[PDB]
Amino acid sequence: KLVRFLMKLSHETVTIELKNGTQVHGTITGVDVSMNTHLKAVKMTLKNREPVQLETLSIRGNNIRYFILPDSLPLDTLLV
Amino acid sequence: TGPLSVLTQSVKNNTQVLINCRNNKKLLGRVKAFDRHCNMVLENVKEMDRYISKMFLRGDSVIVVLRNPLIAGK
Numbered sequence A: 001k002l003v004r005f006l007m008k009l010s011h012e013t014v015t016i017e018l019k020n021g022t023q024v025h026g027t028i029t030g031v032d033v034s035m036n037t038h039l040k041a042v043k044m045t046l047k048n049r050e051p052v053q054l055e056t057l058s059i060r061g062n063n064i065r066y067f068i069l070p071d072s073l074p075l076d077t078l079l080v
Numbered sequence B: 001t002g003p004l005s006v007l008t009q010s011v012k013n014n015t016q017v018l019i020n021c022r023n024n025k026k027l028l029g030r031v032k033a034f035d036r037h038c039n040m041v042l043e044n045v046k047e048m049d050r051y052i053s054k055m056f057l058r059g060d061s062v063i064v065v066l067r068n069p070l071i072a073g074k
Helices: A002-007 B004-013
Strands: A013-018 A023-031 A037-045 A052-059 A064-068 B016-021 B026-034 B040-047 B050-057 B062-067
Touching: A002 A023, A002 B026, A002 B040, A002 B050, A013 A037, A023 A052, B004 B016, B004 B026, B004 B062, B026 B050
Parallel strands: none
Antiparallel strands: A013 A023, A013 A064, A023 A037, A037 A052, A064 B050, B016 B026, B016 B062, B026 B040, B040 B050
């Protein structure tokens, strides 16, 4: 239910916070049933270190704290 | 229920919720949707600072979710 919600966020740009508080900014390319998330055009910021630019990043769903969703996402229509 | 009923009620009342998480994090906002695992879609979130308009939270952070309604009168 909520897993699908994530699965419809392909091509979003989001900021993902990891359990270590690393901050991953990027564009979603796919999210799978376990919330493993694949991004492109990535800016990864470790706490208190300059950010690393990356073409792609894949993140383990269990390594994720939350997704900072886009401001203009239509929450209602995603949740039919 | 434990927290599942705090949340179903919170969605019903559109009422603010204090989400107390893992390592001393707190999130304050409105629960849109939530599942059995305490995964949540949240709006108008104050992180304890930082404001977040819309957020998807994973359940396994969550220790306790407390209600924080607005009440008229003494």
